[PDB]
Amino acid sequence: NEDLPISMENPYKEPLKKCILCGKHVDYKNVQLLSQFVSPFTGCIYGRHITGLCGKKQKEITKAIKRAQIMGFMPVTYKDPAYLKDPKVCNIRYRE
Amino acid sequence: EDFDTRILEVRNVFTMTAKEGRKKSIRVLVAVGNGKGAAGFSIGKATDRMDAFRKAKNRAVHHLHYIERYEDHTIFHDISLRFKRTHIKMKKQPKGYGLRCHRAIITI
Amino acid sequence: EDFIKKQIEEFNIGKRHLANMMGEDPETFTQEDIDRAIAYLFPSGLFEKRARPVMKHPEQIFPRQRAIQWGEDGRPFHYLFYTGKQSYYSLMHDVYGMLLNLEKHQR
Amino acid sequence: FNDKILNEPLKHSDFFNVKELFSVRSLFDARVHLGHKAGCRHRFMEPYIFGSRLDHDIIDLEQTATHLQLALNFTAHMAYRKGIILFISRNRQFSYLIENMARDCGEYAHTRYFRGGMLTNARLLFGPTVRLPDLIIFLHTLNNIFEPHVAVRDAAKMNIPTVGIVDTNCNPCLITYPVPGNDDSPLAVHLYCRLFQTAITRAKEKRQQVEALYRLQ
Amino acid sequence: AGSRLETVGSIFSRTRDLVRAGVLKEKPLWFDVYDAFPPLREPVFQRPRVRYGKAKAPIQDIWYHEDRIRAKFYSVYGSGQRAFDLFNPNFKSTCQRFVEKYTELQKLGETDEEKLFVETGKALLA
Amino acid sequence: VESFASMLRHSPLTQMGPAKDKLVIGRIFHIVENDLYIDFGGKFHCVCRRPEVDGEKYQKGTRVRLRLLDLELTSRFLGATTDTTVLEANAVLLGIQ
Ligand SMILES: [Zn+2]
């Protein structure tokens, strides 16, 4: 009677993973953050597997980066060397 | 001794092999039945005809269905079966109608 | 088996006859002697030694089989019958058991 | 005519008293109730499953018990009727155990690679006058792939009823007297071995006793 | 004589029909047994299809009322440093103890969730 | 007399819940030089291996402490109609007793 199970809202479910950048607000004016997701050597934009972002967030980043590049806030064929001594978000070999 | 064996088709099936060329094999569809509702069938194939027949009969004997019948004489009701691409529409009929169906179907 | 037994008797008889024939008189005399006698009085001279004429105790000659692995009223004798190649399987099992025991304990 | 020995037991119900060998509690203890992950569940075992505790399927133990009562009883009956029982498995872990069980009873085993046509071709692999198993038991109805052991199909072909301990990967389908339960854990397997072994032994004893009684009469 | 058509019907049915026909002259010795005590499901072949449409399985994912509490405990107090047994029945983990305490309190603790939890914690501490 | 549901309710596997990172105790029952076959209750066994720290202590019969990383180890792959089980639990050794 009592000891049969009760259909119930999926407990022990750890809240879904975050982008890292989920509540944050990305501007083309902010070069720092944008620089963080570019390769230091080629100035090429990192992918999603590398960056580790939600799709919306990634798109926002990329568009912002593009805007920066055109509007003259950011470099294009490299990542600014003043912003190397910063937190590494991305997952990347080269150097070993 | 209760069972009887009647053939349904005999095809001279060929196959191209490496050194041998075209290999003339015989393929035979045989049925087995005894009256009384029990019957089955088989596809014995071999290089000789007699051999094919004999294999086939044996196979048939091993693989038998039972077919329940209204009285001795009929199917219980009208059947409509699509098998692969053949459709077969069978109708239940009264006594003295005869078998008015495909020759193979009649024999079976 | 009966046939084999019969042959054994017949073989013995043959041997006795041979002994009687030859200068070596006793009914008890070795296989080598018999062979020699055979060579002497059925000299084939062929190079294949299996194709030469011989007569022996047919338990040497015949390749014996494991006759009757089930008794009357079915019921196979050995417990691993339905494996097929049963003896080998049994041996393997035994070996495994031994290994287990050993483990428990400690050309 | 001494055919009151074969029919009287049929007439009675649970005449070997095989239900007594186990309970639900016992089954629980032996971890019979566990199954595979819910992704690995096979469609045709869903009626026998209770639910799934965090994606891990749990078998209905009452149902198992019900099935067990049938299957074991059937086995016992077979044993009584001078019938060949054949235990089969392909788990390796439990091969030795199964062989031992087979040895101890009057019955047989085949825990090794099942060759093509041990039952369908028997006439050739052994002599022309063979008595095939009158019953078969699978402790593990899967081969060492997660695919149904050839033997079920073969058994069906040969018109031999198969008991089978079936987990959440396996088709019952062709198995005559299935028993839902844990295949892959050892305790459960051990329990199964115990029970089946006991049933057969009882059958052997009981039949003998009956024979003796009839002789006396 | 005999049949070996796995998918037509059950073995038993096949046997019975052959007996009726008068082909299998003697019955196989299991047949009688089967008749006496048949299984719950009749053993016929079934083609295992795939779930395609809006056709999910009957199975219910099992949850009990204490599960939430347990989860909460886990979130608060990490998976116990006390080792779980699993071999012996009636083992009582710390989580289990907590749950029991909660049960004892509510019904008739009457202070609702967080408060109840706090009370339980206090009790444990004592 | 008990039911089944009731039994399930008050049994250690249901008492714990999810197996992810739960310090559990369990005995080792089989050995092949490096690897140790560990039963910890549950559906399957698992294997860890002999560490450098007191390797000659981990013998057949002894108790050991597992971290437990899932109970079953399964996964479904590109063309698979069903996930392919390993029949092992994946549980990391803490030590002894
Ligand atoms: Zn399993």
Swiss-Prot record, chain B:
Protein name: Small ribosomal subunit protein uS5m
Domain S5 DRBM residues, every copy: 3-67
Native source species: Homo sapiens (Human)
Description of how the protein assembles with itself and partners: Component of the mitochondrial small ribosomal subunit (mt-SSU). Mature mammalian 55S mitochondrial ribosomes consist of a small (28S) and a large (39S) subunit. The 28S small subunit contains a 12S ribosomal RNA (12S mt-rRNA) and 30 different proteins. The 39S large subunit contains a 16S rRNA (16S mt-rRNA), a copy of mitochondrial valine transfer RNA (mt-tRNA(Val)), which plays an integral structural role, and 52 different proteins.
Family: Belongs to the universal ribosomal protein uS5 family.
UniProt gene name: MRPS5
Included range, full protein: 216 to 323 of 430
Compartmental location: Mitochondrion
UniProtKB/Swiss-Prot annotation, chain C:
Superkingdom of this protein's organism: Eukaryota
Compartment(s) where it occurs, according to its Swiss-Prot or TrEMBL record: Mitochondrion
Transmembrane segments: none
Disulphide bridges, residue numbers: none
Subunit structure: Component of the mitochondrial small ribosomal subunit (mt-SSU). Mature mammalian 55S mitochondrial ribosomes consist of a small (28S) and a large (39S) subunit. The 28S small subunit contains a 12S ribosomal RNA (12S mt-rRNA) and 30 different proteins. The 39S large subunit contains a 16S rRNA (16S mt-rRNA), a copy of mitochondrial valine transfer RNA (mt-tRNA(Val)), which plays an integral structural role, and 52 different proteins.
Family (UniProt): Belongs to the universal ribosomal protein uS9 family.
Protein name: Small ribosomal subunit protein uS9m
Gene symbol of the encoding locus: MRPS9
UniProtKB/Swiss-Prot annotation, chain E:
Modified residues (N6-acetyllysine): 101
Domain of life according to the entry: Eukaryota
Reported disease: Combined oxidative phosphorylation deficiency 46: An autosomal recessive disorder characterized by childhood-onset mitochondrial respiratory chain complex deficiencies, particularly complexes I and IV, and hepatic disease.
Keywords (A to Z) from UniProt: Acetylation, Disease variant, Mitochondrion, Primary mitochondrial disease, Ribonucleoprotein, Ribosomal protein
Annotated protein name in UniProt: Small ribosomal subunit protein mS23
Molecular-function GO terms, alphabetical: RNA binding; structural constituent of ribosome
Subcellular location: Mitochondrion
Assigned protein family: Belongs to the mitochondrion-specific ribosomal protein mS23 family.
Gene Ontology cellular component terms for the protein in this record: mitochondrial inner membrane; mitochondrial small ribosomal subunit; mitochondrion; nuclear membrane
Assembly and oligomerization: Component of the mitochondrial small ribosomal subunit (mt-SSU). Mature mammalian 55S mitochondrial ribosomes consist of a small (28S) and a large (39S) subunit. The 28S small subunit contains a 12S ribosomal RNA (12S mt-rRNA) and 30 different proteins. The 39S large subunit contains a 16S rRNA (16S mt-rRNA), a copy of mitochondrial valine transfer RNA (mt-tRNA(Val)), which plays an integral structural role, and 52 different proteins.
Modified residues (N-acetylalanine): 1
Residue ranges of the TM segments: none
Swiss-Prot record, chain F:
GO molecular function per UniProt: RNA binding
Organism: Homo sapiens
Keyword Ribonucleoprotein annotated: yes
Keyword Ribosomal protein belongs to the record: yes
Protein name stated in the entry: Small ribosomal subunit protein bS1m
Protein family (similarity comment): Belongs to the bacterial ribosomal protein bS1 family.
Location, primary (coarse class): mitochondrion
Gene Ontology biological process: mitochondrial translation
Coverage span on the entire protein: 77 to 173 of 187
Modified residues (N6-acetyllysine): 57
Gene for this chain: MRPS28
Subunit annotation: Component of the mitochondrial small ribosomal subunit (mt-SSU). Mature mammalian 55S mitochondrial ribosomes consist of a small (28S) and a large (39S) subunit. The 28S small subunit contains a 12S ribosomal RNA (12S mt-rRNA) and 30 different proteins. The 39S large subunit contains a 16S rRNA (16S mt-rRNA), a copy of mitochondrial valine transfer RNA (mt-tRNA(Val)), which plays an integral structural role, and 52 different proteins.
GO cellular component: mitochondrial inner membrane; mitochondrial small ribosomal subunit; mitochondrion
Disease cited in the entry: Combined oxidative phosphorylation deficiency 47: An autosomal recessive, multisystemic, mitochondrial disorder characterized by intrauterine growth retardation, swallowing difficulties with failure to thrive, hypoglycemia, dehydration, and hepatomegaly. Additional features include global developmental delay with impaired intellectual development and absent speech, microcephaly, facial dysmorphism, cataract, sensorineural deafness, skeletal features, and cryptorchidism.
Cellular localization per UniProt: Mitochondrion
